[model samples]
Target: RVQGRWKVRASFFKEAAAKEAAAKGFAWNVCVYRNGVRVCHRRAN
Candidate 1:
């Protein structure tokens, strides 16, 4: 089980970490929020 005030944010592409702000033609995308909304959503291409 997980606990504590969890808040994780992640994104990738180059060293600047800004490849058109992620998702060009569908490659990588994952999410999971609870304290605010949307719980579980892992999609990939």
Candidate 2:
């Protein structure tokens, strides 16, 4: 997700996606899941 002055942009992916989101100026929030259950989440700015 990209935090701007007025809004937040976000995206969701299953596996190893693209790095284009960051190249276009976006923060990353990685949600880790196992066996259809959420395990952990990693956020980046």
Candidate 3:
């Protein structure tokens, strides 16, 4: 199985900016992970 979520900049201080980011696909700064050791081992930018 796999899990995932979305992440974004903390500077998205404006609601419109946040929504725009998601609408434009820039908010796809997303992630995915699995249940195994090797697969679960990961790093984020």
State which candidate has the highest TM-score: 3
* Per-residue lDDT of model 1, residues 1-45, tens digit only: 654344223222233355454445443545557788766554653
List the candidate numbers ranked by lDDT, top first: 2, 1, 3
True-structure Cα RMSD, model 2: 11.4
For model 3, what is the error of residue 36's alpha carbon versus the real structure, in angstroms, after optimal superposition? 7.3
- CA shift at 1, candidate 2, in angstroms? 18
C-alpha lDDT (0 to 100) for residue 20 of candidate 3: 53
Residue pairs with clashing backbones, model 3? none
TM-score, every prediction: 0.19, 0.21, 0.22
Give the alpha-carbon lDDT of every model. Answer: 0.47, 0.52, 0.43
The residue-by-residue lDDT of candidate 2 on 1-44, one tens digit each, is: 75664442333333226656665445544656788987655564
Instruction: Tell me which of candidates 1 and 3 scores higher on lDDT.
Output: 1
Stretches of model 3 off by over 4 angstroms after superposition: 1-11, 15-21, 35-45
Candidate 3 lDDT (Cα, 0 to 1):
0.43
Local error of candidate 3 at 15, Å?
6.9
Residue 22 CA displacement from its true place in model 2, Å: 18
Among residues 3 or more apart in sequence or in different chains, the pairs in candidate 2 whose N, CA or C atoms overlap within 3 Å are none
Q: What count of clashes does model 2 give?
A: 0
